[PDB]
Every structure is written in structure tokens, then in C-alpha cells.
Design a binder for these strands. Structure first.
Ligand SMILES: [Mg+2]
Ligand SMILES: [Mg+2]
Ligand SMILES: [Mg+2]
Length: 430
DNA sequence: ATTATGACGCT
DNA sequence: AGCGTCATG
């Protein structure tokens, strides 16, 4: 009753750039704008692998993981932009630099946690407090929320998309208790006002459109963000959770899309997130461990405590390349040449990172995959990273992996390597 | 023959 | 430390 916490203490948003690599290419090349298009890596094998798809192309069934030659069968007019190649491998610098552009704008409004190259969480609790003091009990006009959806509304006693959106927003704003500075629904609404402003600033200063979710925690914010894409934002209130979760497949919740979510479904004999409420916390802990069990018990009630970490920069800087099928590396010269290519890209990125961000990596991690192993990584070994020098890094990586060579011959490498990966980690201020 | 990443948990 | 899992531009 009066002591049951409801997880309404924070306002958290998740901002995700719409089809991000596609938008970067469309900004650069206006001929791609408002077209079915996709971004591909490489070209020789089946036209290259698609990694990002504009919403126009998605309407034809084009998806990530498609080969471009297959996507062209669904969408013959599909336009393609290729990722840059440097030192024989894909180079994603253009997109990393664009991400920094966006993250720096977001950081003007609040502390952010970089979750990926194109998404960031925002803790808006204090900004909402501020804006509420400024508003002086003034109601919130729908004009301040021109792209906001209220999940679960309209409900109760027009046939266009935007008309629906506005009816739901009107129902929400009519029920609002604006004289209560501690109303969670009011704080979420002010949070959405701020996120509209943030999204306006991103689009004005970069050209890029994004979607966003606003709720009381990171999991609900991420889920909300996905509800209305693209170029829209969604508010998921605590009250909306029972109906939302009542038909929500467990796999749609971040961290439950893989084996653990499959075991929740199998062991408990349920399908939807809301069904989890019928188990005790001890029951869930017994099946899924203390940590997961407690997390599931709270999360199916809309409650989650994971903080927005103040981290705008990646924790690791890595370079990797697959060598599939026939291209697997089978000679020592081959392995050394590619280790050097990877190390040269890594040195370039590390030197720029040291200049930009006043930090130095201290550990080099070397990972390989060998032909036939089903695991993505077959071997992972770390060594000291003492100098940003590509020849030294590649020699060290070769030293830490050299005893993987089964070959009785010094020159041959067996069994051949299908993946090389170098990662710089454990940064210290400098 | 997706591929190139990146974060975090377990032991 | 090294491995697994999860995410997916
Ligand atoms: Mg995105
Ligand atoms: Mg994203
Ligand atoms: Mg995606």
C-alpha cells in the first residue's frame, strides 16, 4: 500500500537516431534524400551486406543483414551507399564523428550515457524540476508537444494518424494535475517538452532526425522509443504499464531477446511480460538467479533502478575483420600483414582519442577465431599497451597468438584464421 | 559468407 | 584474466 515503491522517482529518456548511417550518407549526398536507400559494407560478395535501411526502403521489405543483391530483388530502385574502405577493411570513422556531433548537442541539456553509436540515455529529473519551477503552475500546451505520442491513449467513448496522436495527447493533458510539482505524470510530461526541444536542436544543428522514449527508467524509455518511429517520441507512464505489458512478448524487453528470455518463456510457460506478475520474487530468483529474479520481479511491474551512467565516450576502441570461407588467413605473412593493417587503424584512432579526450589506453586485447569453431571468439589474450605504435602493437598481438598455429611448418598457419580483432582498453587520464 | 563493433556478467 | 551473452549501425 503506502509503502510499496512505484519506481516513479526519475525521468529518463532514450534518444535514438533514425536509420543513422543512412541519414549520415543522405546529409552528404542530397541525391539520396527521401529515397529508398541502404548502407552496405563491401561489394564483391552478393553486392555487399546491408547494415542500415531508410524507412522508404523498409516498406519494400529491405532489412539489415540482407545482401544487397537480394534487397535489389525486393526493391529494384534501391539506392546504395558504401562504407569507406581503408587498409583493406571497412572504416566507420564518418559515422563515429557524426555520433560525436549529436552527443555533444545532447550534453547541453543533461548528463547522457552513450549506449551505442546512435543512442543515448538522458537523466532529465533535475532539468524537469527546473522547468517546473519556471512554469509557475502554468499548464502545458499541446503546441509544446508537436511530435509526442501518449502510449495507451486515446481510450474510451477521425481515422488519420496525426488525428489519433492529437486525440491521445488531448486526453492526457486534460487529465493532468499541473499544480502538483511532485506528480510523476506531470514530470514525465515536462520531460517530454524538454526532449522535443532536444530533438529540435539536434535536427537544426545536424540535419539528423531521431525518435525518443520518455519514461521513469531506461528499459521503459527504450521500449517507448521503439513504439512510434520514425521522427516521433513516445511517453510511457507508470499507469500505462499493465495494459502495455499484457500483450508484450517477453523478447521485446532489453536483455530478454536471447537465451534468458527463451528460458523465461520455456520454464514458466508464459508469453507476455505482464504474466510475470503472478510469480513471487523468490520463485523468479530460483529459476533465473538472485539478480535476474529480482530484476524481473520489479521490471514486470514497470520498475527498474539501473542508473543513467555519466559516460559520453566509449570505454574501448577496437578494430576487427572477418575472413570468411576461402579468404581465411593461412600463412604467417598473411596474419602479420592483417595484424598490421588493424594496428595501423587502431593507432590512428587512439592518437585522435588521446588528443580529443585526454586519456590513454593501457591494455591491448587480441582476439581470433579459427576455422570451424562455432564461437565468434575462439581465443582472447591481453597484453600491455605502452606506446601508440602500430608496428609494436602488431608484433605484440602476433606474439600473444603465435602459439595457436598448429602447423609444423613455420610459414603456414593452420588451422586458418577467420577473424582478427584488436581492442584498446583500460583508459587512464593523461 | 553479414560484418564491425561495444557493454556488461560470470567465475 | 578469459569466456559468454546480448545488442544491432
Ligand atoms: Mg537508430
Ligand atoms: Mg540505436
Ligand atoms: Mg536498428
Amino acid at each position: 500500500g503506502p509503502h510499496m515503491a512505484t519506481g516513479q522517482d526519475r525521468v529518463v529518456a532514450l534518444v535514438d537516431m533514425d536509420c543513422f548511417f543512412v541519414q549520415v550518407e543522405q546529409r552528404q549526398n542530397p541525391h539520396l534524400r527521401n529515397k529508398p536507400c541502404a548502407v552496405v559494407q563491401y561489394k564483391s560478395w552478393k553486392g555487399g551486406g546491408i547494415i542500415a535501411v531508410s524507412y522508404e526502403a523498409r516498406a519494400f521489405g529491405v532489412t539489415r543483414s540482407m545482401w544487397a543483391d537480394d534487397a535489389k530483388k525486393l526493391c529494384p530502385d534501391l539506392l546504395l551507399a558504401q562504407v569507406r574502405e581503408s587498409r583493406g577493411k571497412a572504416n566507420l570513422t564518418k559515422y563515429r564523428e557524426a555520433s560525436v556531433e549529436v552527443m555533444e548537442i545532447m550534453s547541453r541539456f543533461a548528463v547522457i550515457e552513450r549506449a551505442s553509436i546512435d543512442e543515448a540515455y538522458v537523466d532529465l529529473t533535475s532539468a524537469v524540476q527546473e522547468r517546473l519551477q519556471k512554469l509557475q503552475g502554468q499548464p502545458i500546451s499541446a503546441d509544446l508537444l508537436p511530435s509526442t505520442y501518449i502510449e495507451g491513449l486515446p481510450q474510451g467513448p477521425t481515422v488519420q494518424k496525426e488525428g489519433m496522436r492529437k486525440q491521445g495527447l488531448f486526453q492526457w493533458l486534460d487529465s493532468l494535475q499541473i499544480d502538483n510539482l511532485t506528480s510523476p505524470d506531470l514530470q514525465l510530461t515536462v520531460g517530454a517538452v524538454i526532449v522535443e526541444e532536444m530533438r529540435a536542436a539536434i535536427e537544426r544543428e545536424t540535419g539528423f532526425q531521431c525518435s525518443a522514449g520518455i519514461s521513469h527508467n531506461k528499459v521503459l524509455a527504450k521500449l517507448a522509443c521503439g513504439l512510434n518511429k520514425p521522427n516521433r517520441q513516445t511517453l510511457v507512464s507508470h499507469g500505462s504499464v499493465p495494459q502495455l505489458f499484457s500483450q508484450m512478448p517477453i523478447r521485446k524487453i532489453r536483455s530478454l531477446g536471447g537465451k534468458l528470455g527463451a528460458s523465461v518463456i520455456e520454464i514458466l510457460g508464459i508469453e507476455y511480460m505482464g504474466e510475470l506478475t503472478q510469480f513471487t520474487e523468490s520463485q523468479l530468483q530460483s529459476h533465473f538467479g538472485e539478480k535476474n529474479g529480482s530484476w524481473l520481479y520489479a521490471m514486470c511491474r514497470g520498475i527498474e533502478h539501473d542508473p543513467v551512467k555519466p559516460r559520453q565516450l566509449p570505454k574501448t576502441i577496437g578494430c576487427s575483420k572477418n575472413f570468411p570461407g576461402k579468404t581465411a588467413l593461412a600463412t604467417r605473412e598473411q596474419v602479420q600483414w592483417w595484424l598490421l593493417q588493424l594496428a595501423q587503424e587502431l593507432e590512428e584512432r587512439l592518437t585522435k582519442d588521446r588528443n580529443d579526450n585526454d586519456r590513454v589506453a593501457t591494455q591491448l586485447v587480441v582476439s581470433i577465431r579459427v576455422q570451424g569453431d562455432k564461437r565468434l571468439s575462439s581465443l582472447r589474450r591481453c597484453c600491455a599497451l605502452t606506446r601508440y605504435d602500430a608496428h609494436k602493437m602488431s608484433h605484440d598481438a602476433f606474439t600473444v597468438i603465435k602459439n595457436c598455429n598448429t602447423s609444423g611448418i613455420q610459414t603456414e598457419w593452420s588451422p586458418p584464421l577467420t577473424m582478427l580483432f584488436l581492442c584498446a582498453t583500460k583508459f587512464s587520464a593523461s
